[PDB]
Amino acid sequence: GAMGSMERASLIQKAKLAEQAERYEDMAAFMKGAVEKGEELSCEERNLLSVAYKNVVGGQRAAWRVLSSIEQKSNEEGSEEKGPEVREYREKVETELQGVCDTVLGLLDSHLIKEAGDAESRVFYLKMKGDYYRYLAEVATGDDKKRIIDSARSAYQEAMDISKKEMPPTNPIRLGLALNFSVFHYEIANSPEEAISLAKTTFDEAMADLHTLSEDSYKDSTLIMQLLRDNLTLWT
Amino acid sequence: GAMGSMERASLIQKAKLAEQAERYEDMAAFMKGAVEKGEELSCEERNLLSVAYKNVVGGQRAAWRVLSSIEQKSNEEGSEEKGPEVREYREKVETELQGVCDTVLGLLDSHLIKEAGDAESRVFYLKMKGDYYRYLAEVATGDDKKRIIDSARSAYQEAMDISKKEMPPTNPIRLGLALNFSVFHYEIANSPEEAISLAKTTFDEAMADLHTLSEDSYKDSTLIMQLLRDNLTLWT
Amino acid sequence: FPATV
Amino acid sequence: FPATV
Ligand SMILES: COC[C@H]1CC[C@H]2[C@@H](C)[C@@H](O)[C@H](O[C@H]3O[C@@H]4COC(C)(C)O[C@H]4[C@H](O)[C@H]3O)C3=C(C(C)C)C[C@H](O)[C@]3(C)C[C@H]12
Ligand SMILES: COC[C@H]1CC[C@H]2[C@@H](C)[C@@H](O)[C@H](O[C@H]3O[C@@H]4COC(C)(C)O[C@H]4[C@H](O)[C@H]3O)C3=C(C(C)C)C[C@H](O)[C@]3(C)C[C@H]12
Numbered sequence: 001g002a003m004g005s006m007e008r009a010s011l012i013q014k015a016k017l018a019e020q021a022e023r024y025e026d027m028a029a030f031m032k033g034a035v036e037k038g039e040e041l042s043c044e045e046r047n048l049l050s051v052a053y054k055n056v057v058g059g060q061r062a063a064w065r066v067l068s069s070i071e072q073k074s075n076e077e078g079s080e081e082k083g084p085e086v087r088e089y090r091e092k093v094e095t096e097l098q099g100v101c102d103t104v105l106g107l108l109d110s111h112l113i114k115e116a117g118d119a120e121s122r123v124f125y126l127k128m129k130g131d132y133y134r135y136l137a138e139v140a141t142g143d144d145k146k147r148i149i150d151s152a153r154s155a156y157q158e159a160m161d162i163s164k165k166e167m168p169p170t171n172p173i174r175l176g177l178a179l180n181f182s183v184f185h186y187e188i189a190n191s192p193e194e195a196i197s198l199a200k201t202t203f204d205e206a207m208a209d210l211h212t213l214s215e216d217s218y219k220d221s222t223l224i225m226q227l228l229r230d231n232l233t234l235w236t
Numbered sequence: 237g238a239m240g241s242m243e244r245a246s247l248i249q250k251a252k253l254a255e256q257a258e259r260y261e262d263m264a265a266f267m268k269g270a271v272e273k274g275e276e277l278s279c280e281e282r283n284l285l286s287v288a289y290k291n292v293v294g295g296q297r298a299a300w301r302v303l304s305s306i307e308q309k310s311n312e313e314g315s316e317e318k319g320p321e322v323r324e325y326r327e328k329v330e331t332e333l334q335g336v337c338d339t340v341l342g343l344l345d346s347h348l349i350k351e352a353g354d355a356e357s358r359v360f361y362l363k364m365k366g367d368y369y370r371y372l373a374e375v376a377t378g379d380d381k382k383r384i385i386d387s388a389r390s391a392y393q394e395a396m397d398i399s400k401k402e403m404p405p406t407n408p409i410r411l412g413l414a415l416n417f418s419v420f421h422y423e424i425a426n427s428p429e430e431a432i433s434l435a436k437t438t439f440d441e442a443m444a445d446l447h448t449l450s451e452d453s454y455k456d457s458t459l460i461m462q463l464l465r466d467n468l469t470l471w472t
Numbered sequence: 473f474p475a476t477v
Numbered sequence: 478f479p480a481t482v
């Protein structure tokens with residue numbers, strides 16, 4: 001790896017610089033290098049990893065959706081044939097997106113998940129595993145769309161089981177996991193009732209636990225709760 | 237080149253798709269491939285070339301400025317030493333930026349400028365040459381900051397001479413050239429009076445020529461005139 | 473699209 | 478920064 005010669009601390013420092021500069025591809029490469037040093041990630045480092053790859057794949061997903069929409073219109077009645085280019089370029093972006101997802105899933109499998117014993121880290125990494133299988137599922141069509149969907153579900157489910165046993169209902173990682181698993185149900189698994197039920201139950205149990213928190217803990221938490229409510233309002 | 241096997245028309249089609257998807261690195265690579273087919277670019281194709289590279293280098297410049305600012309603060313009195321990382325990463329972004337500028341300048345020199353006979357294309361390409369030497373000048377320090385600045389000035393000046401002889405004062409390319417050469421004077425060449433004089437004279441002569449135009453020609457033109465006025469208000 | 477974090 | 482096109 002091209003980051004093999006750089007100190008772990010320097011990789012973390014540069015990931016933070018890359019974040020400040022909104023250079024998320026660089027950020028992701030620095031954080032991959034840090035993971036490959038073989039040591040566990042701290043809480044802050046896990047956030048750097050997630051932010052970097054979420055932003056890289058987020059841009060790829062946005063571009064893929066633009067191109068897929070153009071492609072679908074090109075295949076409607078009365079559309080002029082313009083050749084293979086739209087498909088080719090959509091495929092190019094898709095393959096790049098799949099590559100980034102595969103890279104993240106490989107880091108999680110080698111060896112972040114197996115060394116993660118504390119609930120915070122284990123739920124965090126399993127949520128990411130669900131997220132990146134979900135992104136693979138968004139572009140999947142062939143003989144493994146179903147296996148990819150079940151891989152996402154399995155990871156989200158294991159994270160959910162741990163989060164409910166080991167984390168308070170207002171924990172931001174537990175909340176964000178529930179938010180994203182609810183979106184998986186709505187958008188991937190064709191299970192809108194499960195999506196709504198999960199978002200509602202999560203919101204209500206978090207509300208009832210807010211009284212235990214300091215003013216700052218009452219923050220990204222109430223923040224993610226608003227996202228649950230936003231989704232519920234979109235869906236009902 | 238990796239685009240050597242792709243049809244020119246397919247490269248242009250994909251550059252337009254990349255633009256729609258805001259994938260400007262891809263857009264720039266497609267348009268480099270198109271230029272390297274060896275045929276002249278049409279008016280619309282020249283715009284695709286410019287938009288692609290302006291956006292790529294624009295992001296690099298924004299990131300470079302973020303990092304240079306962090307670096308300058310790190311070198312102020314009382315700042316804790318944190319090692320070589322900020323310099324290294326600024327250098328990394330800088331080298332990438334220089335590489336993109338060198339690529340654009342190479343396309344212009346091989347062989348867009350030499351085959352450009354019409355005023356529109358020749359002024360357009362010489363303006364780009366000034367622009368990309370200007371970006372090199374923004375990051376230059378060593379024994380060739382001055383030669384880089386003079387290269388920018390020479391290209392802008394040749395474009396100006398042609399534009400004044402061959403184009404009406406309201407021509408959008410003439411106007412945009414004057415806008416950018418005025419910024420070169422203010423920000424690069426330490427010549428704020430020349431910058432102000434150029435922006436004012438350009439604005440006034442364009443105003444007096446607006447009466448000759450259709451409603452649509454009275455558009456990106458009045459649009460660039462507003463940018464001249466914006467700069468004049470920043471500078472006075 | 474719905475919100476995810 | 479000033480405007481360029
Ligand atoms: C693998 O699943 C990660 C998800 C689970 C839930 C959430 C929490 C870890 C959350 O704790 C975290 O928040 C921290 O990282 C944020 C980065 O983004 C900015 C705007 C800078 O704010 C930061 C916050 O201040 C800081 O608390 C984060 C978010 C907050 C804003 C809800 C969104 C970011 O995707 C993430 C890093 C991601 C995650
Ligand atoms: C090498 O120097 C190129 C400069 C000279 C002046 C200007 C003209 C060529 C101008 O004619 C041109 O405009 C066309 O391309 C625009 C692309 O951006 C959007 C927002 C899509 O609008 C488009 C306009 O509608 C369309 O007329 C363009 C701009 C207009 C909006 C002023 C800004 C773009 O840098 C550029 C492609 C660039 C150039």
Ligand SMILES: [Mg+2]
Pocket residue numbers: 007008
């Ligand atoms: Mg070491």
Ligand SMILES: [Mg+2]
Pocket residue numbers: 091094095
């Ligand atoms: Mg495919």
Ligand SMILES: [Mg+2]
Pocket residue numbers: none
């Ligand atoms: Mg349940």
Ligand SMILES: [Mg+2]
Pocket residue numbers: 243244
């Ligand atoms: Mg051909």
Ligand SMILES: [Mg+2]
Pocket residue numbers: 327330331
């Ligand atoms: Mg350098």
Ligand SMILES: [Mg+2]
Pocket residue numbers: none
């Ligand atoms: Mg003069």
